[PDB]
Design a protein around this ligand. Structure first.
Ligand SMILES: [Ca+2]
Ligand SMILES: [Ca+2]
Ligand SMILES: [Ca+2]
Ligand SMILES: [Ca+2]
Ligand SMILES: [Ca+2]
Lengths: 28, 145
């Protein structure tokens, strides 16, 4: 399940990165 | 360089996103995957995601773009310390044996709805001493090439 794990955490980090962008905007 | 087994695994992984077989992942296909994992990205968000890994700016992820993105992600779990951190995430009760219930918990929290059968299969493949669980040494073996 090594690759499955890194894919799923990458899918989750694609999502956190997009949230972090809008958060950057709220804060600025 | 990657193992020919790693490149083969990455090809299968790529096929799960490229549901139409056209050699590219579109916002539509990445949307479908994100939604199966319990996320609701907007069209704008889906394009933002493709955009950062889209070297030729054609709006889709081809296999070379995907493989570049995946090989980079694999650097998050390549050190002794990063592999220990990943082991602790899986081994929720701290007893040194990743059970089916634990592996299913990690995968479910990441949005993947697996069957008991899929979970049993991933354990079976990692379970070298054949006790039905994955210990630290098994985990390290499964996390390195
Ligand atoms: Ca496609
Ligand atoms: Ca592209
Ligand atoms: Ca690293
Ligand atoms: Ca355990
Ligand atoms: Ca075992």
């Amino acid at each position: 399940f090594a690759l499955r794990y890194n894919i799923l955490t990458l899918m989750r980090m694609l999502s956190l990165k997009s949230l972090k962008k809008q958060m950057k905007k709220v804060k600025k | 360089q990657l193992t020919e087994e790693q490149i083969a695994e990455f090809k299968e992984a790529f096929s799960l996103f490229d549901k139409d077989g056209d050699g590219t992942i579109t916002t539509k296909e990445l949307g479908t995957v994100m939604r199966s994992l319990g996320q609701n990205p907007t069209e704008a968000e889906l394009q933002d995601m493709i955009n950062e890994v889209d070297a030729d700016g054609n709006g889709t992820i081809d296999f070379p773009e995907f493989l570049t993105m995946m090989a980079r992600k694999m650097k998050d779990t390549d050190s002794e310390e990063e592999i220990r951190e990943a082991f602790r995430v899986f081994d929720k009760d701290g007893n040194g044996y990743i059970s089916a219930a634990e592996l299913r918990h990690v995968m479910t929290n990441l949005g993947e709805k697996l069957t008991d059968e899929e979970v049993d299969e991933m354990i079976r493949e990692a379970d070298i001493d054949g006790d039905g669980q994955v210990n630290y040494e098994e985990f390290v073996q499964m996390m390195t090439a």
